[PDB]
């Protein structure tokens, strides 16, 4: 009954090598999850509004108006790389593997303990009390991944963790007409309420079965099996200038040295080749016809509005703009013995050259008078709209049928692993937040909640909140994430870039004298691959 | 023989309930189709040229220039929702069923009657004459959905209807350089004839078989079978702002009313999460990363020109830009007792929030100093090219690899049901005119004509038009259009928007004192669905 | 054995007729290939840096700065139409076929002869020397289509050819800030070096097994089988204005001649139809709701900057911009008896009307008042950014989900046949340079070299380059390429445009007085096809 | 019953084609005026000996 344990701790990573070059990587994780009771048992609808700061002109991007259903439940989320892989295993994966397939995911809650607090304080075991656990096997609830806010389980096996109090967006209608510093007057800035057509009030109790676990009980999610396409751990460097056959060089440097360039022998208007410029005889590396377009230029720092307020248009890649910035706390990589409230931050400067350098772009007139006059070219120095700070590249969009693009790299430790595909009829080609996209269904979210230990005084017909015995739970969570990965091959003569310890990064990977630990970010897409 | 009927009028619709929550909806439609003989038996080539109205400057958008091959044949087109379902049936579909598939379509012409007019007028039956009937099973003829002109069969089972006189576009070449009022001089508004490379002249006689039905026998089309992807009768509300985990709220409200907002606890630069703004520490609902972009800004009221003159660039989702405006006559929904040429009109404001609100958009500089100065933000108040009426969002496109979109909702009664997919090598994601799109083949267009009932005076070598006995026919047409649809389930606590008779809309659904009838538009995506 | 011949020349085209209107076209091509020894045996990294030309302001598009590995091997590339089909066979293909599949490809080297030169010049057979032959079956090396540079095998069977010296792009980092004439000073124009993360050095010696052929031996590339989607040899004349049912004409013309137009009978504001304009009652051929968008506008002559320097952003289809312009030499179509270095050129004006006419574009305000005032309309004549030459259509992009597009047409003789699909995670819709794209694997590149005939004086410790017995090889190359094409059917009444000989082009196709030859370009997509 | 031809020679042969001159012989007029014009039956050359 009470006295017998209900599952073994396990945080080992198993590397089951197979011939034909594949490895089945089984990341086991376990944590002690601590769960206080809810602040209130009721479901609440809370409207956030920050007109106190957004109504100041120019602060348009600081909009936080939204409506959310704050729930009495907490969510246990393992959807982040740091939950599964320590730095050494991640080093092995990035340094040796070439592509990475996510295979399966499973979860267990075991060794549940329930304790009452009495008050000096004394702690009493509630052998009769119970922990509610619910699995959204059918994904009826809104998908609410916690890595976006840095609220997943902790990344250290030996520290307890806490689950995030769960909430989801309710519908609101809001408009915020933008304005600059020195605008003549107060812009239109109001919250409209909500549309009856879009009301969606979800509850765990009506949506999913809820298991009650006392002390001896276990909950075990059966193995979810993914079908996701591979993530590739090797970046592409070939931009459009470096696709295809280079021009033949007649003048080769006959004294080997840095300053001794080679020269194409033939004048620029007398070369052979193909250009996509029907009226231009000059064949140059800028003009010559490549097969297609790598990357695309996007309107950078463009905010677009609809019924629920303004939001940034996301970008697939960056040079800066576009590169993601992760801000995170002490459970998720910041040095655990820091005292401050300020989060740790990095921006992931990805290796891949799919981005654009907008300071070098231009458009010039169709006539192509070659040493261009001012009237025949539009540069990034030139205004648009009369504004000196905004140039044409800010409003430019060169996505097209010829665009080629890469899926987003995995960002260790804070980045997501999987994401649910949109229910839209026309589905986005990639997601900017996760490398793998569940196409048909995704793993069930796991919700937890400690039951009400009522006092003797309860009367449902009283207006006041129900009195509850102050209770908390600690339960051990375990999970197993299976990947299938391909080992790399040495195509080139030269060696590749590899993650390695060095004198600078040495003390990031080991604990300090007073016990503190950190996890620095480590790049994934290290080895180069041919684009074409 | 002559006196035996050859078919049953049937305008019922059965709902056949299959296992596992599917309903096979069999829509039967029957119509008495009345057909006058053609104005001329010869195929004509006619150029329309409103140079007079487009030469006055500013009237560029009123360009009606086209060439077409006026044809003796007439087309029976049943490709509109109103031909099949009445308002009660449409209510039962949309209020209760979540997705809808096409299954099959078939047609029958039966009970042909031929009559001749002689001068007072005496009407006499011609048992020897024949209705010429042709089916383009192979889709060799140019496709012409009659819904875009509101020339489908009538939507009332009792009234007789008429088929559309058939015609199809011919080649032509045109240039219309645009011009505002107050332009110095006349633009080059000229018609260049037809490219010989592009000539296609089609005739029913040379292309498809033809059946000479007479009064005593039927024509029947085999059961065509669709393979289209499901149209979904439910709408998505979630803007980018409403995807993912909302921020945690630390100060929940303690009293009722709209004044009691809840507040996020920590300062915007000390919050935690993932933004896609590498140089910016502010994490806000506008700046926080989302999986992908729902909807896209498109350059609104952009007219774009090809060899065949200007046309509007279509837009996939409206907010009134984008939303379709239907103009229709007394066969097809207008109150039949009204006088006057003027059509009735509605604009279909769809429920879905995949649109944009252009006045709220803005673009600002990479540096992102927070209270943005005038020189550093381009607003919709700012003129492109010095034109005060044309702000940047008119000339602005944000389609990209992250755009997600829904298919167009069904529009009742005038919207198309199915559409033929293009024979392009690269095919569009969606068609803006119908929910279902035929992937490889589509239902054959049914062409009808009455044979030349000649007089004794005929001489083919005479230049003048042939003398014909004035003939007309009535033939009963029977269609059967089968759907398969899934019954909805109540996942939310709250109820959904539903179509209902009420005191306002009551008398739209019953005939008037002198028997006038109308069919109002009814919204096809009522129940909300979970995008993420 | 030395003297036994090891193959047979074959340059025939067999048209083999299958069931159901298919034709298996077996193009055989045979050439004599002449290969001198490499200039030096070592691999050379060379950087081209033409700062002398581009440091002059406005010479931005003349950027030729790049790095490459100059490799001693030479590439034998048959990837062009002229290598396989002569003008008569191409006439038969374009005039009689409708779609053209690509089936298989195989290669052979046979009748190798090696010779050496001794000083008058004496030519001596090298019975013991060998020709190195290497097939990259796995595509380890970068794909390198020689047709982009016009360095394929020559198109005349009776004339010898030389293979291209192989080279491939190394990585380089570059910034080139653009400038117009009379910019204040020298802008940033610098070569940064190479990123170590992107270095890739490939040797044929390590990546492929190298065969050694002396004289009596052969190498036969086994049959590679493609899986490419079909190329269509018909062109789409319909643009958006010619999709759907034309408006009904009440006023048909009653007399002959182009100056007797027909007229639509109903005023534009009392006209039935559908429009994507919620606030506009005017239904007209510009505004009527078409199914989708055939073609798209793109920013014309837009140059975009990557990490490696500016490049021309490509366009899918042209009207001009977008139409490819070829420059080609004596082996590849120019008059073979001409003096001078200048290449022969053509611009391939494709027959398909999917392109745009930017001078006909206009954008007008959402209110849509008809005689548009200057402030409410933006025209292609209006300046943007204060520049008079550049207008909004240079910045504009209409690409959206509704875009439909055609694949790149074949260009006879200088265009490619196949190209390798990019290894990116999201791949382009089409390629602008080859009609067929290999889906997963593409036929192996064949690299050839003559092995070193060292002198007796060789010493690897010597500072100077090695000494070699001057040697060269002639080897006969044969290839077989199989297509599968569908014969056309005469759907129209009218004849189609067809390739023909006539008095203007008569002496292009037959040799001249002193034996000169040329191959004039021939258009592929002749017969019209209907989209809709 | 007819035999499809074969391209024996290097050069392109004469072929029947629509062009700017003969275009409106093969499509009707304003008032249904229709015509058919003579088209040459024998176009490809043949080696007699």
Curated annotation (Swiss-Prot), chains A, B, C:
<dbReference type="GO" id="GO:0075512">
    <property type="term" value="P:clathrin-dependent endocytosis of virus by host cell"/>
</dbReference>
<comment type="function">
    <text>Capsid protein self-assembles to form an icosahedral capsid with a T=1 symmetry, about 22 nm in diameter, and consisting of 60 copies of two size variants of the capsid proteins, VP1 and VP2, which differ by the presence of an N-terminal extension in the minor protein VP1. The capsid encapsulates the genomic ssDNA. Capsid proteins are responsible for the attachment to host cell receptor TFRC. This attachment induces virion internalization predominantly through clathrin-endocytosis.</text>
</comment>
<comment type="subunit">
    <text>Interacts with host TFRC.</text>
</comment>
<dbReference type="GO" id="GO:0140267">
    <property type="term" value="P:symbiont entry into host cell via permeabilization of host membrane"/>
</dbReference>
<keyword id="KW-1162">Viral penetration into host cytoplasm</keyword>
<keyword id="KW-1234">Viral attachment to host entry receptor</keyword>
<keyword id="KW-1161">Viral attachment to host cell</keyword>
<keyword id="KW-0460">Magnesium</keyword>
<keyword id="KW-0945">Host-virus interaction</keyword>
<keyword id="KW-1173">Viral penetration via permeabilization of host membrane</keyword>
<dbReference type="GO" id="GO:0098671">
    <property type="term" value="P:adhesion receptor-mediated virion attachment to host cell"/>
</dbReference>
<keyword id="KW-0946">Virion</keyword>
<keyword id="KW-0479">Metal-binding</keyword>
<keyword id="KW-1163">Viral penetration into host nucleus</keyword>
<feature type="disulfide bond">
    <location>
        <begin position="438"/>
        <end position="442"/>
    </location>
</feature>
<dbReference type="GO" id="GO:0046872">
    <property type="term" value="F:metal ion binding"/>
</dbReference>
<feature type="binding site">
    <location>
        <position position="138"/>
    </location>
    <ligand>
        <name>Mg(2+)</name>
    </ligand>
</feature>
<keyword id="KW-1015">Disulfide bond</keyword>
<keyword id="KW-1140">T=1 icosahedral capsid protein</keyword>
<keyword id="KW-1177">Microtubular inwards viral transport</keyword>
<protein>
    <recommendedName>
        <fullName>Capsid protein VP1</fullName>
    </recommendedName>
</protein>
<keyword id="KW-1048">Host nucleus</keyword>
<keyword id="KW-1164">Virus endocytosis by host</keyword>
<dbReference type="GO" id="GO:0043657">
    <property type="term" value="C:host cell"/>
</dbReference>
<dbReference type="GO" id="GO:0075521">
    <property type="term" value="P:microtubule-dependent intracellular transport of viral material towards nucleus"/>
</dbReference>
<comment type="similarity">
    <text>Belongs to the parvoviridae capsid protein family.</text>
</comment>
<keyword id="KW-1176">Cytoplasmic inwards viral transport</keyword>
<dbReference type="GO" id="GO:0075732">
    <property type="term" value="P:viral penetration into host nucleus"/>
</dbReference>
<keyword id="KW-1233">Viral attachment to host adhesion receptor</keyword>
<keyword id="KW-0167">Capsid protein</keyword>
<dbReference type="GO" id="GO:0098670">
    <property type="term" value="P:entry receptor-mediated virion attachment to host cell"/>
</dbReference>
<dbReference type="GO" id="GO:0039615">
    <property type="term" value="C:T=1 icosahedral viral capsid"/>
</dbReference>
<keyword id="KW-1160">Virus entry into host cell</keyword>
<dbReference type="GO" id="GO:0005198">
    <property type="term" value="F:structural molecule activity"/>
</dbReference>
<dbReference type="GO" id="GO:0042025">
    <property type="term" value="C:host cell nucleus"/>
</dbReference>
<keyword id="KW-1165">Clathrin-mediated endocytosis of virus by host</keyword>
